[PDB]
Amino acid sequence: GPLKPEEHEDILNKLLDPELAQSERTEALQQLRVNYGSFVSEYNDLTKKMDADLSQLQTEVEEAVQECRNAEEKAKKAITDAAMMAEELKKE
Amino acid sequence: KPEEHEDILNKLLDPELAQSERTEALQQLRVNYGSFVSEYNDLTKKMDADLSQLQTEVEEAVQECRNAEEKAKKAITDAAMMAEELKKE
Amino acid sequence: PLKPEEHEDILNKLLDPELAQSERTEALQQLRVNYGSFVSEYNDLTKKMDADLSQLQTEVEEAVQECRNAEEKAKKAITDAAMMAEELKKE
Amino acid sequence: GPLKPEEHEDILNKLLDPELAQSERTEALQQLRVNYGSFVSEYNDLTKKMDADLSQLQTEVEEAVQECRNAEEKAKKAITDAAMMAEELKKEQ
């Protein structure tokens, strides 16, 4: 997978030799180009996935929030009906 | 009747009381008592039904709190699920 | 409390003009005790129910407040999740 | 690692030169060495913040769960109180 630090350092070390064969130089540069493009791509795939994850969590917690509003509304109806029952008994 | 009920009982104490005036006094206690027992039974029936309805309506709010728990627990499990999903890659 | 049929027997007993004064006074005292106690039971029943309805309102209002506190904690997680997305945009 | 893929490509194209002076070849590889170490640390901190964010959100939502259970039990006791009131009204009869 992605080049580890020590494995990445070995490539940079052999690229330091000016008399390195061109076939080996292009091969090492290709490894850096493929590894850097794959690592950048993986970084953007996690940034996008986390942003969508945080957005999905906000929508799911909001449905629990709205359910708390239903609890307050129904409980307040029992309060209103209890006061209505009190006024109803004093009318008679 | 509040105070006139004692006036009717005081008038019926007279053994001289005319039978027409005695029957009218006893019938006044007859209609008033039947009206009072009905209002009492209507009261004990109304408050028993009122408290039963309040239990049902407050229970509706209890269930909404349960639904809120279930929605929020789903967000907790989903958040934990998208945590192990990030470590898989 | 005196039942409607049992109350009718006392009224029919008082209808008798030949009834002795000892039983007539005792039958009227039977109606005076029954009525004053019946009115007292009715008023005390109304007073107790009004205190019950007022107490239930207070107890449910406190349950509403806990629902509000639960709502504000859940909304805080939404607000914190939103700033977590903005703080990951520090690129 | 703020090096965009086009900036990284120019360094690779520079290292392709066989006649490249040793000082320029050493400097170019030093840029990649520092940039790669800064990009791995940024990747590790990202995976660290993502796990800590999802853990803190679970904790805050669980705090909201415990209060919903508390509000549930408060209202359930009001139901029992309402039932105990109806039982006490019937006892006095």
Curated annotation (Swiss-Prot), chain A:
It comes from the Viruses. Belongs to the phi29likevirus scaffolding protein family. Homodimer. Interacts non-specifically with DNA; probably binds DNA in the early stages of DNA packaging. Scaffolding protein involved in the icosahedric procapsid assembly. Coassembles with the capsid proteins to form the procapsid. The scaffolding protein is found within the capsid as a serie of concentric shells. During DNA packaging, the scaffolding protein molecules are released from the procapsid. This is Capsid assembly scaffolding protein. The gene is 7.
UniProtKB/Swiss-Prot annotation, chain B:
It comes from the Eukaryota. It is found in: Cytoplasm, Myofibril; Cytoplasm, Myofibril, Sarcomere. The rodlike tail sequence is highly repetitive, showing cycles of a 28-residue repeat pattern composed of 4 heptapeptides, characteristic for alpha-helical coiled coils. Limited proteolysis of myosin heavy chain produces 1 light meromyosin (LMM) and 1 heavy meromyosin (HMM). HMM can be further cleaved into 2 globular subfragments (S1) and 1 rod-shaped subfragment (S2). Muscle myosin is a hexameric protein that consists of 2 heavy chain subunits (MHC), 2 alkali light chain subunits (MLC) and 2 regulatory light chain subunits (MLC-2). Interacts with ECPAS. Interacts (via C-terminus) with LRRC39. It is linked to Cardiomyopathy, familial hypertrophic, 1: A hereditary heart disorder characterized by ventricular hypertrophy, which is usually asymmetric and often involves the interventricular septum. The symptoms include dyspnea, syncope, collapse, palpitations, and chest pain. They can be readily provoked by exercise. The disorder has inter- and intrafamilial variability ranging from benign to malignant forms with high risk of cardiac failure and sudden cardiac death. Congenital myopathy 7A, myosin storage, autosomal dominant: A skeletal muscle disorder characterized by prominent axial and proximal weakening, spinal stiffness, severe scoliosis, with or without respiratory and cardiac involvement. The age at symptom onset can range from early childhood to late adulthood, and disease severity ranges from asymptomatic to severe muscular weakness and respiratory insufficiency. Histopathological examination shows variable findings including subsarcolemmal hyaline bodies in type 1 fibers. Belongs to the TRAFAC class myosin-kinesin ATPase superfamily. Myosin family. The chain holds residues 1728 to 1772 of 1935 of the full protein. Myosins are actin-based motor molecules with ATPase activity essential for muscle contraction. Forms regular bipolar thick filaments that, together with actin thin filaments, constitute the fundamental contractile unit of skeletal and cardiac muscle. The cardiac alpha isoform is a 'fast' ATPase myosin, while the beta isoform is a 'slow' ATPase. The lineage of its organism: Eukaryota, Metazoa, Chordata, Craniata, Vertebrata. This is Myosin-7. It comes from Homo sapiens.
